[PDB]
Amino acid sequence: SSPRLFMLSSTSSDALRQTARQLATWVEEHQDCVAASDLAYTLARGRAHRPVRTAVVAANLPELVEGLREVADGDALYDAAVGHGDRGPVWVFSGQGSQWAAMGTQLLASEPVFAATIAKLEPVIAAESGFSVTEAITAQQTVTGIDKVQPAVFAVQVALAATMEQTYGVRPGAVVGHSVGESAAAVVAGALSLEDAARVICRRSKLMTRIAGAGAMGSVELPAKQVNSELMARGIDDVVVSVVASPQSTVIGGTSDTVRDLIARWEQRDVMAREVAVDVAFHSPQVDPILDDLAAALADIAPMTPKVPYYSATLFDPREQPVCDGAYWVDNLRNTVQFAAAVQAAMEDGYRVFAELSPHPLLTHAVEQTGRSLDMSVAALAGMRREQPLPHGLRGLLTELHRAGAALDYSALYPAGRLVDAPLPAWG
Template identity: 60%
Template sequence: MGEVAAAVVSGVLSLEDGVKVICRRSRLMATLAGAGAMASGRAARPAGAVGVGRTRRQRVVLAVVASPKSTVVGGAKESIRALIAEWESRDIMAREVAVDVASHTPQVDPILDQLADELTDLDPAEPTIPYYSATLYDPRDLAEWDADYWVDNLRHTVRFAAAVQAALEDGFRVFTELAPHPLLTHAVDQTARTLDIPHMALATMRRDQELTGGLLGAVADLHSAGARVDFAAVCPQGRLIDAPLPVWNRQQLMLVRDPNELAPGGAVLAVHPLLGAHVRLAEEPERHVWQSDVGTDTQPWLGDHQVHNVAALPGAVYCEMALAAGRAVVGDAAELRDISFDQMLLLEEQSLVSASATVTGDGAADFVVETVHEGERVRRAAARIRRNRLRGGAGRL
């Protein structure tokens, strides 16, 4: 039925004629309800077609070629369910489609003559925009779009993948599915990816989504994808205006260096602004320690991270401290494992933290960040540091 909608949009059928095709076809198909079924399978068409023909003795036929990797078959209900079980046993994704008539199969043969008779009053016209048929062998062929065409449309295999491929080959790159819920967007994506053609496949509406929001969102997506949008049709009373430029609130956030960071002669030592000065204890050569002030006076930018309106040291800071310590202890290929955040540190104007990395083996160390609260040491975060022997460069989490 999707091709009927396409025929109306392209000017082939009037809205009245499109409704005739849908309603008369649906009324006749209702007389066949109950005996048929259809199933969707994630399998390439040749393998699917061979499996259907050999194992079901033509009681199941190929109904839709949605993409190079997705097909729909139709036929007798018991045969379809047996085929689904067979496909699943071969690890082919399959599911039964929620219909009770097998369109595009011999099951609809009894109503074809009557459908042709009831559609003789159609008045088709030439399309006003490019039309790719999913019924004809060549999607680009111009059809008559008369009663016989719509009979073939009901009976023949739907060649959706071929129609999408033809449109892609002709230079179309943006596809939009107009449906209550996306069913074919993924098929378009699969076809384009198989051909290695850049594209955009967009859905307009989804279940449980407000209609207006979905359609307006689709218009925005189309515009962003480069499609030409007639905004006058969407907002006939509106006018385009220039959006105001952003107003930047420029503030210099300088890292304040402690006087202790100066070496004799006034040279500045390489001190990490969050870790502080690196000290290696002579009595414990395997232990490296740092101490720094991460308070909001020293690092005012840390005050932007707040919990219940109180500045708190973010987890990213602990990770950066651990990576910096790791590079100092095991080299640039340091990486972090088993990161834990033990207790939140609420920042004051001055907040002293101590960090240590204790070497536990070749290329490994334990990292801990602590503070002193009311005379007791409080562990704030910890991590395992390890040298990645397979890679160099900057550290990673």
């Protein structure tokens, strides 16, 4: 008598409501004869999912009739799936800045695979960085200090991915990382072992404590070519383009005073500009002092050939396969994050469903902007949000991935049951 996920789909919002009404009448008439588990199994594994999808959560059949009649009697607009169930989702791993107080507490309790992944990482992060990652992600106050934030966010990122694959049967179609997000992207793509990637993130963030407070970063709603023309024109040498987020968005990095002055100036011209909370100006010459030490610390990291398509934001061709050695991690920290090019390559290759596996979404609008420039209908989802209750763990993200059209293994969530005589809607 536990709550179950009942999938419902059709060809339009009106047809989906007619389908909901038809199913509610059937469930109402046969509730004494049908097991909720069999009906959920039948709707997920015995039905071809149509473009306009939804799902009703219910613990009993009369609760499902109420949920279905709520859908049927409503006037909601149901967006159609953008993926065709042929490719898995593209996991997007953002950099730092997404952290929030006790971000890992609900998932440690509700998702056993999240807890088992944090358990694997716990001794590695303790040996490398000298702290408990479990205390960090469950503390009443947000994790602070670059040496604590980077391993804590990486741990949430990889534990989210492992949960999605092991518990929900969502194998990624591809991965895309943004700045330090590439550490989790490399584990998930099989370019690094979980332990080696933790060593990479721990060693890089310890060295970065030496350059804490060296600069600032800022977002601007201008294309990078335009931003660079403005910096050269103004004779600015202490600030550079650090991230190329989208065709219409750029992140600059450099000295604190000049970055703040550039944001204030863009605001005064009615150009949307924001300071990004970061003490270190990453992907700029501010990180130069640390790079020789980083290369030496990562000399014994053993890279592997990625098993999943990996779209690099470090390399000058995103389609190129990374050799995730110490040189790669030095270039990842110093080079401009070509995130827009990586997302563009994945979209050109046919990927339409993107899901950000991070404590809070930092790149969902960047993904949408790239899609819009390509005239593509894409979905940019968020794995979790700051202070969002997750009572049924990541089951909601599984629902949003299904609604969007991502390819997944329905046998992970609906392993067994009997196919029932539920209605089959003819044209649509």
